[PDB]
């Protein structure tokens, strides 16, 4: 299976994100991903703005073990349709 997370600041989620997606900023990820993604084998696409927050999510995702993250890319390379908070 997979989860589309955006990984940005909660304020920046809310300004517009890409549809059918959840948001755990990379501040909260750590406390909650485990609540969102609780099988680790799940694929996770993490995006955000401009990417850091994805590719810093990441990180600390392969050490939590998570094996299946993705950087996706960040909202505006990313094809998919959004919509607003």
């Given at each position: 299976?997979?989860?589309?997370?955006?990984?940005?600041?909660?304020?920046?989620?809310?300004?517009?994100?890409?549809?059918?997606?959840?948001?755990?900023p990379?501040?909260?990820?750590k406390?909650?991903?485990?609540?969102?993604?609780?099988?680790?084998?799940?694929?996770?696409?993490?995006?955000?703005?401009?990417?850091?927050?994805?590719?810093?999510?990441?990180?600390?995702?392969?050490?939590?073990?998570?094996?299946?993250?993705?950087?996706?890319?960040?909202?505006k390379?990313?094809?998919?349709?959004?919509?607003?908070?």
């Open positions: 299976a997979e989860h589309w997370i955006d990984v940005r600041v909660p304020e920046q989620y809310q300004q517009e994100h890409v549809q059918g997606a959840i948001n755990i990379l501040k909260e990820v406390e909650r991903i485990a609540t969102a993604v609780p099988d680790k084998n799940d694929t996770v696409k993490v995006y955000c703005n401009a990417g850091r927050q994805s590719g810093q999510a990441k990180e600390i995702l392969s050490e939590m073990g998570y094996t299946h993250v993705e950087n996706a890319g960040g909202l390379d990313i094809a998919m349709p959004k919509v607003k908070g």
